[PDB]
Design an enzyme around this catalytic site. Structure first.
Site, mmCIF file in Angstrom:
data_model
loop_
_atom_site.group_PDB
_atom_site.id
_atom_site.type_symbol
_atom_site.label_atom_id
_atom_site.label_comp_id
_atom_site.label_asym_id
_atom_site.label_seq_id
_atom_site.Cartn_x
_atom_site.Cartn_y
_atom_site.Cartn_z
ATOM 1 N N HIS C 202 19.500 41.020 61.878
ATOM 2 C CA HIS C 202 19.908 39.863 61.109
ATOM 3 C C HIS C 202 20.076 38.645 62.001
ATOM 4 N N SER C 206 13.973 38.868 59.467
ATOM 5 C CA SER C 206 12.679 39.512 59.327
ATOM 6 C C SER C 206 11.590 38.683 59.991
ATOM 7 N N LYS C 228 10.549 42.100 43.728
ATOM 8 C CA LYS C 228 9.345 42.609 44.367
ATOM 9 C C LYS C 228 9.533 44.061 44.823
ATOM 10 N N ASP C 229 10.754 44.432 45.236
ATOM 11 C CA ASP C 229 11.084 45.799 45.629
ATOM 12 C C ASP C 229 10.989 46.746 44.432
ATOM 13 N N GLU C 272 6.055 71.488 59.761
ATOM 14 C CA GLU C 272 5.804 70.643 58.610
ATOM 15 C C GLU C 272 4.829 69.537 58.992
HETATM 16 C C1 HEM Z 1 15.967 55.490 57.555
HETATM 17 C C2 HEM Z 1 15.049 54.768 58.166
HETATM 18 C C3 HEM Z 1 14.957 53.308 58.015
HETATM 19 C C4 HEM Z 1 15.413 52.436 57.048
HETATM 20 C C5 HEM Z 1 16.164 52.780 55.768
HETATM 21 C C6 HEM Z 1 14.955 51.153 57.456
HETATM 22 C C7 HEM Z 1 15.174 50.017 56.674
HETATM 23 C C8 HEM Z 1 14.724 48.764 57.007
HETATM 24 C C9 HEM Z 1 14.865 47.599 56.170
HETATM 25 C C10 HEM Z 1 15.503 47.458 54.742
HETATM 26 C C11 HEM Z 1 14.313 46.581 56.912
HETATM 27 C C12 HEM Z 1 14.216 45.144 56.443
HETATM 28 C C13 HEM Z 1 13.047 45.092 55.431
HETATM 29 C C14 HEM Z 1 11.698 45.544 55.988
HETATM 30 O O1 HEM Z 1 11.110 44.970 56.932
HETATM 31 O O2 HEM Z 1 11.064 46.515 55.560
HETATM 32 C C15 HEM Z 1 13.847 47.099 58.157
HETATM 33 C C16 HEM Z 1 13.291 46.318 59.147
HETATM 34 C C17 HEM Z 1 12.910 46.919 60.342
HETATM 35 N N1 HEM Z 1 12.939 48.211 60.702
HETATM 36 FE FE1 HEM Z 1 13.538 49.643 59.647
HETATM 37 N N2 HEM Z 1 14.293 51.257 58.608
HETATM 38 C C18 HEM Z 1 14.248 52.518 58.997
HETATM 39 C C19 HEM Z 1 13.692 53.129 60.078
HETATM 40 C C20 HEM Z 1 13.104 52.349 61.049
HETATM 41 C C21 HEM Z 1 12.422 52.849 62.151
HETATM 42 C C22 HEM Z 1 12.208 54.313 62.414
HETATM 43 C C23 HEM Z 1 12.043 51.751 62.916
HETATM 44 C C24 HEM Z 1 11.329 51.718 64.219
HETATM 45 C C25 HEM Z 1 10.781 52.713 64.926
HETATM 46 C C26 HEM Z 1 12.470 50.572 62.255
HETATM 47 C C27 HEM Z 1 12.250 49.334 62.805
HETATM 48 C C28 HEM Z 1 12.476 48.259 61.977
HETATM 49 C C29 HEM Z 1 12.108 46.931 62.475
HETATM 50 C C30 HEM Z 1 11.592 46.573 63.856
HETATM 51 C C31 HEM Z 1 12.375 46.105 61.444
HETATM 52 C C32 HEM Z 1 12.176 44.626 61.442
HETATM 53 C C33 HEM Z 1 10.728 44.433 60.974
HETATM 54 C C34 HEM Z 1 10.488 43.002 60.561
HETATM 55 O O3 HEM Z 1 11.001 42.475 59.542
HETATM 56 O O4 HEM Z 1 9.713 42.317 61.217
HETATM 57 N N3 HEM Z 1 13.112 50.988 61.124
HETATM 58 N N4 HEM Z 1 14.121 48.449 58.186
HETATM 59 C C1 HEM Z 2 17.589 62.305 55.634
HETATM 60 C C2 HEM Z 2 18.113 63.126 54.757
HETATM 61 C C3 HEM Z 2 17.561 64.477 54.608
HETATM 62 C C4 HEM Z 2 16.335 65.044 54.906
HETATM 63 C C5 HEM Z 2 15.081 64.401 55.518
HETATM 64 C C6 HEM Z 2 16.470 66.417 54.515
HETATM 65 C C7 HEM Z 2 15.444 67.334 54.666
HETATM 66 C C8 HEM Z 2 15.539 68.641 54.211
HETATM 67 C C9 HEM Z 2 14.472 69.557 54.230
HETATM 68 C C10 HEM Z 2 13.102 69.271 54.776
HETATM 69 C C11 HEM Z 2 14.892 70.731 53.686
HETATM 70 C C12 HEM Z 2 13.995 71.946 53.528
HETATM 71 C C13 HEM Z 2 13.688 71.880 52.025
HETATM 72 C C14 HEM Z 2 12.966 73.052 51.414
HETATM 73 O O1 HEM Z 2 11.781 73.283 51.740
HETATM 74 O O2 HEM Z 2 13.504 73.787 50.552
HETATM 75 C C15 HEM Z 2 16.241 70.543 53.305
HETATM 76 C C16 HEM Z 2 17.024 71.533 52.773
HETATM 77 C C17 HEM Z 2 18.358 71.286 52.503
HETATM 78 N N1 HEM Z 2 19.069 70.145 52.674
HETATM 79 FE FE1 HEM Z 2 18.403 68.494 53.318
HETATM 80 N N2 HEM Z 2 17.680 66.653 54.018
HETATM 81 C C18 HEM Z 2 18.389 65.532 54.053
HETATM 82 C C19 HEM Z 2 19.706 65.298 53.650
HETATM 83 C C20 HEM Z 2 20.551 66.317 53.253
HETATM 84 C C21 HEM Z 2 21.920 66.130 52.986
HETATM 85 C C22 HEM Z 2 22.713 64.856 53.109
HETATM 86 C C23 HEM Z 2 22.444 67.320 52.576
HETATM 87 C C24 HEM Z 2 23.874 67.466 52.272
HETATM 88 C C25 HEM Z 2 24.254 68.704 52.493
HETATM 89 C C26 HEM Z 2 21.371 68.274 52.628
HETATM 90 C C27 HEM Z 2 21.469 69.568 52.234
HETATM 91 C C28 HEM Z 2 20.336 70.410 52.248
HETATM 92 C C29 HEM Z 2 20.438 71.820 51.786
HETATM 93 C C30 HEM Z 2 21.693 72.510 51.287
HETATM 94 C C31 HEM Z 2 19.204 72.367 51.961
HETATM 95 C C32 HEM Z 2 18.776 73.799 51.717
HETATM 96 C C33 HEM Z 2 18.408 74.098 50.284
HETATM 97 C C34 HEM Z 2 16.937 73.811 50.139
HETATM 98 O O3 HEM Z 2 16.036 74.251 50.898
HETATM 99 O O4 HEM Z 2 16.605 73.038 49.245
HETATM 100 N N3 HEM Z 2 20.239 67.601 53.023
HETATM 101 N N4 HEM Z 2 16.608 69.248 53.648
HETATM 102 C C1 LIG Z 3 22.087 46.198 53.282
HETATM 103 C C2 LIG Z 3 23.222 46.979 52.654
HETATM 104 C C3 LIG Z 3 24.211 46.031 51.971
HETATM 105 C C4 LIG Z 3 25.591 46.004 52.623
HETATM 106 C C5 LIG Z 3 25.678 44.967 53.746
HETATM 107 C C6 LIG Z 3 25.766 45.686 55.077
HETATM 108 C C7 LIG Z 3 27.232 45.772 55.490
HETATM 109 C C8 LIG Z 3 27.404 45.337 56.933
HETATM 110 C C9 LIG Z 3 27.298 43.828 56.986
HETATM 111 C C10 LIG Z 3 28.357 43.244 57.889
HETATM 112 C C11 LIG Z 3 27.952 43.156 59.342
HETATM 113 C C12 LIG Z 3 28.225 41.732 59.767
HETATM 114 O O1 LIG Z 3 27.104 40.990 59.275
HETATM 115 C C13 LIG Z 3 27.301 39.609 59.466
HETATM 116 O O2 LIG Z 3 28.149 39.079 58.443
HETATM 117 C C14 LIG Z 3 28.278 37.650 58.405
HETATM 118 C C15 LIG Z 3 29.041 37.333 57.131
HETATM 119 O O3 LIG Z 3 28.977 38.441 56.218
HETATM 120 C C16 LIG Z 3 26.905 36.954 58.437
HETATM 121 O O4 LIG Z 3 27.060 35.549 58.652
HETATM 122 C C17 LIG Z 3 26.085 34.752 57.970
HETATM 123 O O5 LIG Z 3 26.536 34.411 56.664
HETATM 124 C C18 LIG Z 3 27.670 33.542 56.501
HETATM 125 C C19 LIG Z 3 27.685 33.152 55.014
HETATM 126 O O6 LIG Z 3 26.962 34.095 54.198
HETATM 127 C C20 LIG Z 3 27.688 32.331 57.465
HETATM 128 O O7 LIG Z 3 29.040 31.977 57.775
HETATM 129 C C21 LIG Z 3 27.014 32.572 58.827
HETATM 130 O O8 LIG Z 3 26.650 31.320 59.420
HETATM 131 C C22 LIG Z 3 25.793 33.494 58.777
HETATM 132 O O9 LIG Z 3 25.395 33.921 60.082
HETATM 133 C C23 LIG Z 3 25.992 37.516 59.531
HETATM 134 O O10 LIG Z 3 24.674 36.954 59.457
HETATM 135 C C24 LIG Z 3 25.900 39.020 59.431
HETATM 136 O O11 LIG Z 3 25.249 39.500 60.597
#
Ligand code: HEM
Ligand code: HEM
Ligand SMILES: CCCCCCCCCCCCO[C@@H]1O[C@H](CO)[C@@H](O[C@H]2O[C@H](CO)[C@@H](O)[C@H](O)[C@H]2O)[C@H](O)[C@H]1O
Ligand SMILES: CCCCCCCCCCCCCCCCCC(=O)OC[C@H](COP(=O)([O-])OCC(O)COP(=O)([O-])OC[C@@H](COC(=O)CCCCCCCCCCCCCCCCC)OC(=O)CCCCCCCCCCCCCCCCC)OC(=O)CCCCCCCCCCCCCCCCC
Ligand SMILES: CCCCCCCCCCCCCCCCCC(=O)OC[C@H](COP(=O)([O-])OCC[N+](C)(C)C)OC(=O)CCCCCCCCCCCCCCCCC
Ligand SMILES: CCCCCCCCCCCCCCCCCC(=O)OC[C@H](COP(=O)([O-])OCC[N+](C)(C)C)OC(=O)CCCCCCCCCCCCCCCCC
Ligand SMILES: CCCCCCCCCCCCCCCCCCCC(=O)O[C@H](COC(=O)CCCCCCCCCCCCCC)COP(=O)(O)OCCN
Ligand SMILES: CCCCCCCCCCCCCC(=O)OC[C@H](COP(=O)([O-])O)OC(=O)CCCCCCCCCCCCC
Ligand SMILES: CCCCCCCCCCCCO[C@@H]1O[C@H](CO)[C@@H](O[C@H]2O[C@H](CO)[C@@H](O)[C@H](O)[C@H]2O)[C@H](O)[C@H]1O
Ligand SMILES: CCCCCCCCCCC1=C(C)C(=O)C(OC)=C(OC)C1=O
Lengths: 54, 59, 383, 124, 75, 438
Positions: C202, C206, C228-229, C272
């Site tokens: 932030h 982006s 858009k999302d 996998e």
């Molecule tokens: C649970 C996994 C992740 C979540 C939920 C996540 C979510 C997001 C979101 C909401 C943004 C801002 C919107 C967007 O650009 O798509 C973002 C930006 C970014 N994420 Fe992730 N991300 C994940 C994993 C990763 C990983 C694995 C990487 C890198 C290896 C990564 C690198 C970045 C970077 C560099 C940006 C900024 C890109 C840009 O706007 O130019 N994230 N991510």
């Molecule tokens: C990033 C989040 C997660 C990923 C990528 C993930 C991935 C997986 C995968 C690959 C399996 C094997 C599924 C199958 O072939 O049956 C699995 C099983 C399981 N996961 Fe997760 N998991 C996630 C989050 C969680 C969380 C938060 C819970 C909370 C307990 C959980 C509970 C389980 C349980 C109980 C199973 C075994 C039952 C089953 O195979 O369906 N997982 N998960």
């Molecule tokens: C994406 C999931 C939604 C939940 C949000 C994520 C929770 C964690 C966010 C808090 C972490 C601190 O994040 C920080 O907060 C302050 C105020 O909120 C922001 O501050 C920004 O907004 C405020 C007004 O909106 C301005 O005073 C400031 O000039 C500007 O930088 C920072 O840009 C952000 O980096």
């Protein structure tokens, strides 16, 4: 005192090294000391004290 | 009461040997001992606690 | 002052999801971040639900998963949703990483969100690996055995560490119960790091497909990117639906419907699909420790992209040679994936080695060369 | 990589007759295929700006150059989000692709690099 | 008469030069010792550490040579 | 190569020291005294400064008005200053007006009236001075800095003295002070510019021959100060500029580390945003401060006394939300005197000082002040060749060793004046006196 400060305390790298080495020594010696003390206050009660009968 | 160049009385607290290496060394001895017991305590805590993950008696 | 700005809690939400200033030209590849957030939410809801009905004890684990499929109302849905979303999570994460590499999202000033991103990716791998073991079918057991034995390669202490991880002398009940506990935890750790990479982002905001500043022309995150999302959310849900309702087992291995048997070894032990490229890289190196180092290095080498990319311009939109190299790099990564699941036979052994060399040479040689030359071509070409 | 580096290396190539004979035509084709001119950018508009040095060079632009750069960035952003290309006068012609920024950044970097050298001077 | 000041530029990289780094070489040494002592201390309980390292130290090393009597060992 | 400083004594023990310059037409003659406020006790604190006022208030011969006229007719001026350890009385004149000026100085020092009427008149003037120093912020800061560093010790007292003493200083105690302290073995008659040494010695024999000698003549510049790590905060939100001084116990004039401490001071150096060159200075602290706009100015100092010193820095800043950064970066640059300095910084500072110690002497008053200071602190004028040798002897090892015993992890005296809300508490400042990474 100056000498001691200069060698072991002044540089934090040396201070942390000294503290860790002392912690190692303390840990080993304290272990042994408590073991002996515990065995003396609980003398004749523990398995090691009756083991010889069997 | 009025002049700011007349420093308040700190004689109840001031050490005479305040600039000496002995004086500093004492306080670092306390800090160091505390760090030493915290290191030994952390080591014991970590070792005993993580050992739960090694094979249990039934295994 | 508006309440959303005045109140500190509301203002944190506001700064991320409503007033957040975004470039006005993000394309559909910027939608994977919200899809990843959706996968993470689905996995939390389904995972916590499965945990209400799953039993981690090795004598009961596999049967508790059958109980989920057969007796729990909508258990089949929750189970297949969880299993398939694990695959979708990796499709979205590869897409998101690919977007980041093509558009130079790793360059200054976004080194920190990228570096935290690399750790998020490692946490996802560990999360998914442990979750797969929980079924305690044949692939669960044998996959755990071979992957956990790679740790034996750590010199001196390796064997001791493996026995420590297993909590015994082979994969069994202690291993399954610890994987359950860690699998439950790891997604929460992952969500924290996902949040950290966003907070780190932030500060620059982006990036955008042109690679220039957007400080000149910003759009509120809502309503523009909110709506858009939604399009990609519904596209994702359609793909989810086709797998979960019509083909729930297409992405899985039939052997995982056989209960774990330490005696019988399955014909082929493969990871996998989403881990397959890393497995191919490991096989390429003959040495055990060599192979493990290479496999880990294949992920950690992402950390050096900020250094090895020497370009004065961010991203590939205007760099035809970089675009061709990126195309080859991506296709090679998919070839590695395919070679991860072939048998160790000619001629796939040598091909796997060539593909592994190409994978590393992208980072170490080609990208530094190509980015240097394109710098010179932009300068001379526009004189 | 620094603009200084890029400019120095390019000047080595432009000096060598052989090298220029083979590099200059390639560079011109590269630039044509790059396609930034089709969004009405000049080459220098694409240089990464989120760096202390580049922020300083941009602040030193004459106001007119600065205002025009802002317009080209906004116009290109509008073409990007619409999925259109520039047409007519919005296309950058090769004669309009001037290195307006290169002199400013080369001065900024000259000082920055001299400062680094002089921070390492050894009285002899 | 002096026409020019007399100096050279020492080689440098990322703002480090050899004169400066050389002053820190010993500090890296002590930190390495601190890390070594600390690491070894953390794994002092690991049986292999005792068997391979700690029991081999002269004089002191007998601290880590401890046998459970066969009469007291269920395993 | 400057002309030789000639030195003679009289019988009473008065030193005459002269340095002729046949290129100038003016001369500065004066009397440097190894005595100042530090020689008072708590009851007569302020006497030395009180006397300086009365010295110009009339003698046994010339009245106040006659004194004024005599100096007006000479053509030059007279000037005086009292510090903690030194009093000076000098007269700048034309070449051939030197005998007049020596005679007037001898008169105001030996034969002053100190008439109760004039004591009573100045007692109000000096009382008003107490409420107008308040404006000279650098002086306010340094007077609090001495007060706290040398808490309840003679060096800690002000020169003006407390209001209470000003109301109770009598002609008796004034006379007693100048009779005990202004003795021939503590005094140096100095001439610089168009002065002949032999002429000056004759004028000394004519005017200063009936000066008292002290009972126990110690050598010139002869003195135990116990530094107190401490802080004074004088917060004033209405001031726009914060003034901060930080100091450790430094070195005396005759310390073996005197030059080492000057080289260390030169490594940090001075900075002033108003001077054009200051953004380009080689000093690391200068670079940090100028790039980040942390300060309007900073001035390193290394003040010496006979038996102690203060070494530190004086900072001024309008950047009131980054005072923390300013202090942080300053103390981290001091840390580097202990951990990081090499031949690179040391040789650069030596080059700068080898000239600087000579450059300072650019007029007759500066030359006289240099002769007078050196004769009353060291007992001799140190030739530039000796100074060049002492500087050359300072190595990087010397600076590191000095900083490690003087600066590293040591108590500081800290004074803050103005909008200093952002100056952290004592502990956080003092924690910057070491680096955990080292
Ligand atoms: C649970 C996994 C992740 C979540 C939920 C996540 C979510 C997001 C979101 C909401 C943004 C801002 C919107 C967007 O650009 O798509 C973002 C930006 C970014 N994420 Fe992730 N991300 C994940 C994993 C990763 C990983 C694995 C990487 C890198 C290896 C990564 C690198 C970045 C970077 C560099 C940006 C900024 C890109 C840009 O706007 O130019 N994230 N991510
Ligand atoms: C990033 C989040 C997660 C990923 C990528 C993930 C991935 C997986 C995968 C690959 C399996 C094997 C599924 C199958 O072939 O049956 C699995 C099983 C399981 N996961 Fe997760 N998991 C996630 C989050 C969680 C969380 C938060 C819970 C909370 C307990 C959980 C509970 C389980 C349980 C109980 C199973 C075994 C039952 C089953 O195979 O369906 N997982 N998960
Ligand atoms: C994406 C999931 C939604 C939940 C949000 C994520 C929770 C964690 C966010 C808090 C972490 C601190 O994040 C920080 O907060 C302050 C105020 O909120 C922001 O501050 C920004 O907004 C405020 C007004 O909106 C301005 O005073 C400031 O000039 C500007 O930088 C920072 O840009 C952000 O980096
Ligand atoms: C999984 C879960 C499901 C969710 C789906 C999300 C996927 C959406 C996405 O990111 O891609 C859509 C995306 C459309 O997104 P867009 O925002 O219109 O443009 C993004 C491109 O930068 C714009 O690229 P462009 O404008 O240069 O257009 C190129 C594109 C044409 O793109 C069009 O859609 C037209 O066509 C191709 O590149 C095809 C290659 C030729 C093959 C023969 O499709 C592509 O452009 C794919 C190109 C990849 C190769
Ligand atoms: C829980 C684990 C605690 C382990 C602490 C072990 C050694 C660290 C220690 O004592 O810190 C002292 C040291 C030094 O304490 P210090 O910072 O007061 O000392 C600095 C001044 N010198 C070096 C001159 C003595 O603190 C640290 O380095 C911070 C680590 C503490 C956490
Ligand atoms: C398969 C090989 C892919 C080659 C891509 C080359 C560029 C192209 O034609 O793409 C269209 C578009 C071109 O978009 P663009 O932004 O360069 O150009 C838009 C049009 N102009 C130039 C006029 C402004 O590229 C993308 O949108 C690329 C996103 C990459 C995502 C890759 C996911 C792979 C996962 C592997 C992870 C490790
Ligand atoms: C099933 C999931 C989708 C269903 C919810 C969408 C909203 C349904 C209709 C309501 C609607 O359109 O009104 C707007 C509410 O949208 C909103 O306020 C939200 C806009 C889009 C909804 C979700 C945003 C997704 C963005 C990120 C995806 C994250 C995935 C991770 C889990 C307000 O209309 P208006 O506010 O424009 O103004 C207009 C004047 N008041
Ligand atoms: C166990 C805990 C480990 C803590 C380790 C801390 C090590 C820090 C070393 C360090 O800062 O070296 C600085 C030195 C260069 O000096 P400078 O340029 O910062 O003055 O840098 C170089 O010489 C390179
Ligand atoms: C980054 C940290 C480094 C990795 C951490 C290492 C994890 C495991 C290390 C050792 C754990 C087991 O190590 C083992 O610990 C237990 C105590 O915990 C010790 O056991 C000792 O104390 C316990 C109770 O305190 C007694 O029941 C036992 O009879 C006695 O021998 C063993 O002497 C030691 O061999
Ligand atoms: C629990 C932590 C998960 C972090 C992700 C939750 C945020 C939901 C995605 C919203 C989003 C953000 C924040 C965002 O910054 C952005 O602009 C680049 C997007 O759309 C193009 C987004 O969709």
């Amino acid at each position: 005192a100056t000498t001691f400060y200069n060698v072991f305390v002044k540089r934090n790298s040396a201070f942390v090294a000294t503290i860790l080495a002392s912690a190692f020594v303390f840990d080993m010696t304290f272990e042994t000391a408590i073991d002996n003390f515990w065995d003396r206050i609980n003398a004749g009660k523990q398995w090691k004290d009756i083991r010889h009968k069997y | 009461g009025k002049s700011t160049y007349k420093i308040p009385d700190f004689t109840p607290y001031l050490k005479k040997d305040r600039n000496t290496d002995a004086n500093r060394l004492f306080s670092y001895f306390m800090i160091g001992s505390f760090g030493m017991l915290s290191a030994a305590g952390a080591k014991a805590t970590v070792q005993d606690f993580l050992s739960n993950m090694s094979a249990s008696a039934d295994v | 002052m508006a309440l959303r700005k005045k109140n500190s809690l509301l203002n944190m939400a506001n700064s991320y999801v409503l007033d957040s200033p975004q470039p006005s030209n993000l394309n559909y590849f910027w939608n994977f971040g919200s899809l990843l957030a959706l996968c993470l939410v689905i996995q939390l809801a389904t995972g916590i639900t499965l945990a209400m009905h799953y039993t981690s004890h090795a004598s009961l684990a596999f049967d508790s998963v059958e109980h989920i499929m057969r007796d729990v109302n909508f258990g089949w849905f929750i189970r297949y949703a969880h299993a398939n979303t694990a695959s979708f999570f990796f499709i979205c994460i590869y897409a998101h990483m690919g977007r980041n590499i093509y558009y130079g999202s790793y360059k200054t000033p976004r080194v920190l969100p990228w570096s935290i991103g690399v750790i998020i990716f490692l946490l996802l791998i560990i999360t998914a690996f442990m979750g797969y073991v929980l079924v305690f079918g044949q692939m669960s057991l044998w996959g755990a055995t071979v992957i956990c034995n790679l740790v034996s390669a750590i010199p001196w202490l390796g064997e001791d560490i493996v026995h420590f991880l297993w909590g015994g002398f082979s994969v069994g009940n202690p291993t399954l119960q610890r994987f359950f506990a860690l699998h439950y935890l790891m997604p929460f750790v992952l969500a924290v790091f996902a949040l950290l990479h966003l907070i780190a982002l932030h500060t620059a905001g982006s990036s955008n497909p042109l690679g220039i500043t957007s400080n000149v022309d910003k759009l509120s995150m809502h309503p523009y990117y909110s709506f858009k999302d939604l399009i990609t959310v519904f596209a994702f849900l359609l793909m989810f639906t086709l797998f979960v309702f019509f083909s729930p087992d297409k992405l899985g291995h039939p052997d995982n419907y056989i209960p774990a048997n330490p005696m019988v070894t399955p014909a082929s032990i493969v990871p996998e699909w989403y881990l397959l490229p890393f497995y191919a890289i490991l096989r390429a190196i003959p040495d055990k420790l060599g192979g493990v180092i290479a496999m880990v290095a294949a992920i950690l080498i992402l950390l050096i992209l900020p250094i090895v990319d020497r370009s004065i311009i961010r991203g590939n939109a205007f760099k035809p040679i970089s675009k061709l190299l990126f195309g080859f790099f991506i296709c090679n990564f998919l070839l590695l994936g395919v070679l991860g699941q072939v048998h160790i036979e000619p001629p796939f052994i040598v091909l796997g080695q060539i593909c592994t060399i190409f994978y590393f040479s992208y980072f170490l040689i080609l990208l530094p060369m190509v980015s240097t030359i394109e710098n010179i071509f932009f300068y001379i070409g526009s004189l | 990589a620094s603009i200084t580096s890029v400019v120095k290396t390019s000047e080595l190539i432009l000096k060598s007759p052989l090298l220029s004979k083979i590099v200059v035509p390639l560079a011109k084709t590269y630039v044509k295929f790059s396609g930034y001119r089709q969004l009405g950018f000049k080459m220098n508009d694409l240089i990464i700006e989120e760096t202390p040095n580049m922020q300083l060079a941009l602040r030193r632009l004459p106001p007119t150059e600065s205002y025009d750069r802002v317009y080209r960035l906004i116009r290109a952003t509008q073409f990007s989000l619409s999925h259109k290309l520039a047409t007519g006068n919005d296309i950058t012609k090769p004669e309009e692709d001037d290195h307006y920024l290169i002199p400013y950044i080369l001065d900024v970097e000259a000082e920055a690099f001299e400062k680094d050298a002089l921070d390492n001077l050894e009285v002899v | 008469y002096v026409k020019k000041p007399s100096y050279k530029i020492v080689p440098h990289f990322l703002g480090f030069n050899i004169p400066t780094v050389s002053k820190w070489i010993p500090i890296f040494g002590i930190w390495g010792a601190a890390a070594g002592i600390g690491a070894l201390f953390l794994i002092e309980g690991v049986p292999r550490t005792r068997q391979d390292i700690l029991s081999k130290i002269p004089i002191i090393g007998e601290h880590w040579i401890r046998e459970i009597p066969a009469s007291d060992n269920p395993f | 190569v400057s002309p030789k400083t000639r030195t003679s004594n009289l019988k009473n023990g008065l030193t005459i020291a002269s340095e002729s310059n046949p290129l100038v037409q003016t001369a500065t003659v004066g009397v440097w005294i190894d005595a100042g406020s530090r020689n008072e006790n708590a009851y007569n604190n302020g006497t030395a400064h009180f006397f300086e006022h009365l010295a110009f208030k009339g003698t046994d011969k010339r009245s106040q008005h006659q004194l004024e006229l005599d100096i007006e007719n000479m053509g030059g001026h007279l000037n005086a200053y009292t510090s903690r350890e030194s009093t000076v009385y000098y007269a700048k004149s034309f070449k051939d007006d030197v005998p007049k000026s020596v005679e007037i100085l001898a008169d105001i020092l030996q034969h002053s009236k100190l008439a109760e009427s004039a004591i009573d008149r100045e007692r109000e003037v000096i009382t008003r001075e107490l409420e107008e120093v308040n404006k000279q912020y650098e002086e306010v800061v340094f007077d609090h800095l001495h007060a706290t560093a040398f808490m309840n010790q003679p060096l800690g007292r002000t020169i003006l003295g407390p209001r209470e003493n000003i109301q109770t200083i009598t002609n008796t105690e004034l006379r007693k002070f100048i009779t005990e302290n202004y003795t021939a073995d503590r005094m140096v008659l100095v001439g610089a510019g168009a002065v002949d040494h032999d002429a000056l010695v004759e004028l000394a024999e004519k005017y200063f021959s009936h000066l008292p000698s002290s009972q126990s003549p110690v050598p010139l510049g002869t003195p135990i100060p116990n530094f107190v790590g401490s802080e004074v905060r004088l917060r004033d939100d209405t001031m726009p500029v914060a003034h901060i001084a930080i100091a450790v116990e430094g070195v005396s004039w005759t310390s073996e580390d005197y030059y080492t401490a000057l080289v260390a001071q030169a490594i940090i150096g001075n900075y002033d945003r108003a001077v054009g060159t200051s953004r380009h200075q080689g000093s690391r602290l200068s670079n940090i401060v100028s790039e980040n706009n942390l300060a309007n100015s900073f001035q390193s100092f290394s003040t010496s006394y006979s038996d102690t010193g203060l070494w530190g820095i004086y900072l001024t800043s309008e950047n009131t939300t980054q005072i923390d950064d300013l202090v942080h970066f300053t103390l981290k640059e001091w840390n580097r005197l202990s951990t990081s300095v090499s031949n690179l910084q040391v040789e650069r500072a030596k080059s700068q000082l080898k000239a600087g110690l000579l450059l300072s002497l650019d007029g007759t008053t500066y030359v006289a002040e240099d002769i007078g200071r050196q004769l009353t602190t060291l007992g001799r004028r140190v030739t530039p060749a000796e100074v060049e040798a002492k500087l050359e002897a300072v190595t990087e090892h010397d600076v590191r060793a000095w900083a490690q015993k003087t600066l590293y992890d040591k108590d500081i005296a800290l004074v803050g004046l103005g909008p200093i809300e952002g100056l952290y508490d004592y502990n956080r400042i003092r924690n910057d006196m070491s680096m955990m990474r080292w």
